[PDB]
Structure formats: structure tokens, C-alpha cells
Design an enzyme around this catalytic site. Sequence first.
Site, PDB file in Angstrom:
ATOM      1  CG  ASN A  46      -1.819   1.173   1.341  1.00 37.31           C
ATOM      2  OD1 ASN A  46      -1.450   2.277   0.920  1.00 37.31           O
ATOM      3  ND2 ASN A  46      -3.013   0.980   1.899  1.00 37.31           N
TER       4      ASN A  46
ATOM      5  CD  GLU B 188      -4.284   4.012   0.986  1.00 34.84           C
ATOM      6  OE1 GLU B 188      -3.751   5.150   1.035  1.00 34.84           O
ATOM      7  OE2 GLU B 188      -4.661   3.404   1.994  1.00 34.84           O
TER       8      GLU B 188
ATOM      9  CG  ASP C  29      -4.458  -1.963   3.653  1.00 35.91           C
ATOM     10  OD1 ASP C  29      -4.779  -2.535   4.730  1.00 35.91           O
ATOM     11  OD2 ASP C  29      -4.306  -0.731   3.526  1.00 35.91           O
TER      12      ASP C  29
ATOM     13  CG  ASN D 170      -7.724  -0.962   6.073  1.00 33.51           C
ATOM     14  OD1 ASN D 170      -6.984  -0.316   6.856  1.00 33.51           O
ATOM     15  ND2 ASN D 170      -7.944  -0.591   4.816  1.00 33.51           N
TER      16      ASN D 170
ATOM     17  CG  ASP E  49      -0.569  -3.966   4.540  1.00 36.52           C
ATOM     18  OD1 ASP E  49      -1.182  -3.539   3.557  1.00 36.52           O
ATOM     19  OD2 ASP E  49      -0.182  -3.235   5.495  1.00 36.52           O
TER      20      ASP E  49
ATOM     21  CG  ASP F  13       0.361   4.962   5.955  1.00 38.83           C
ATOM     22  OD1 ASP F  13       0.442   4.555   4.776  1.00 38.83           O
ATOM     23  OD2 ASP F  13      -0.723   5.322   6.464  1.00 38.83           O
ATOM     24  CG  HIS F  14       0.112   0.327   4.653  1.00 38.60           C
ATOM     25  ND1 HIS F  14      -0.718  -0.683   5.081  1.00 38.60           N
ATOM     26  CD2 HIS F  14      -0.639   1.457   4.659  1.00 38.60           C
ATOM     27  CE1 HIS F  14      -1.905  -0.180   5.390  1.00 38.60           C
ATOM     28  NE2 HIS F  14      -1.885   1.117   5.132  1.00 38.60           N
TER      29      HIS F  14
END
Length: 256
Positions: free
Chosen positions: A7, A34, A146, A148, A217, A246-247
Site C-alpha cells: 500500500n 492506494e 491491505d 485493514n 497487510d 505508512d505501510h
Amino acid sequence: MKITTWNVNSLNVRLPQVQNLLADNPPDILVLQELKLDQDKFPAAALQMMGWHCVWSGQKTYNGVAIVSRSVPQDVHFGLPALPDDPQRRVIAATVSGVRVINVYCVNGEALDSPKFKYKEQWFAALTEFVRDEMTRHGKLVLLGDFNIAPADADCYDPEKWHEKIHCSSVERQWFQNLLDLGLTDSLRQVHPEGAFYTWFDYRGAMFQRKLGLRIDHILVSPAMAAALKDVRVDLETRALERPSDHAPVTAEFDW
Ligand SMILES: O=P([O-])(O)O
Ligand SMILES: [Mg+2]
Ligand code: NA
Ligand code: NA
């Protein structure tokens, strides 16, 4: 065979890093979430000119998923049949070197009392149906991205703080279990049954530098792939770069 999911939190922003990841010790297949780029704004030329085949599904501002591979992706599929008119670009699948790859950028959900959490529930139900159907035809199948969702408390730092909160709720964990129940294996936990392997660290509060994150993830594999699984690792070198996503990328390696 090496398959990576990442991501990138905007492909416009992360392109140089994606390029650097493809240039040194590349995977065979890299799937992205993303993109945050409309269909016609995907940097196809930049990656194609590097010798990579790309298929993607983008929309303005939000979401966006891509599959990037040195093999040509076949029988490309977009979206979810049980949720056919959802405009959110979250699911792309293709058959790459004989492996069915389903890349997901799953609904965040926002908060358990958000209307987006009802969206999350319906969207996961639709995903389960598609994946179940896809699995009747492809013995080699990888569902990754991802999600989530942090499957158990070892996957949420300070689990008491996240008790029935977004990503770490009992019901979300049931939705994740519903995918495993199709006949899929959480690859990272097959290789590494114990220990923290976080893949997302909030930018706020320097959480990556503090080692405080969620494992959201994942790479879920059919048994034929589980049997060939050699390792699964979280690419924290990439997460440690200046201006990181951030991932962190997650990679599974298969060895026959
Ligand atoms: O795509 P959103 O605006 O419903 O978050
Ligand atoms: Mg983001
Ligand atoms: Na957002
Ligand atoms: Na690692």
C-alpha cells in the site's frame, strides 16, 4: 517465485521507491494499493519502460489497485460481481505465470459506529463470494493486499487500547476468518507463528520509530501455494526510507 504487496499511499508520491524496488532484487509480481490516481494518470510508461507489464484500476483521489509483473497478466478481472456497481476501485485480479492473483485494497471502515463500517461488512461479504468462486478454478491462488484487519491481538500493538476498535474488532476478525474458511492460509503465520510482524505504522507520533503498528497487510494462499511457501517477510528497509509510505511491503517467497 516472489510476490510482494504494498500500500503505497499515493503512487504519484511513491513512484521513485516503487522503481527502486523493481530495480534491485525485484519480486516476480508486485501488487499495489492506494494508487490515488485516476485511470489515465497511472505512470504506465515509467514502469513499462522498465520492462514491467501493468494492469490497474484507478479513480480520482481515492483507492486504486494495480498488478505489476514481468509476465503478462492474463484474464484480467475488475471489481466484485456481488457488488457490481460500487465505484470504489478496490479489487483487481489476473492470472500471472499460472497463479491467480487477487489484489485487494479493503475498506478501512473508519470506526465501528461509522456508516463506512456497514460498507466494510457488505464489501467483505461480496469479496468472500468472489474469492470462493475463483478458488474452484485455480489451484494456485493468492489473495493479498491491505485487508485493514489485524487478525489477532499479536497484530495490534497495546491490544487493550484497540479493544473492539477499528481494525482489531471481534467482528472484523470474523470477516478475516471467513476468507481463511474458504480454504486459504494466512501465509505469514504459517512461517512465523509467534511474534509481532506489523505492516502499518501511523505517521502520527513517530510510531514506526517506536515499533508500534498493526499487521493489516496479508498474503492468503491456496494449499498448493502453502506447500511451496519458503518465507514471508515484512520489508522494513523500505518503511525506514525518507518520505515512506505508512505501510511496509510484504513479500512471500515460494520455492518448488
Ligand atoms: O471514498 P469516501 O469519500 O466515501 O471515503
Ligand atoms: Mg493512506
Ligand atoms: Na482516507
Ligand atoms: Na523484515
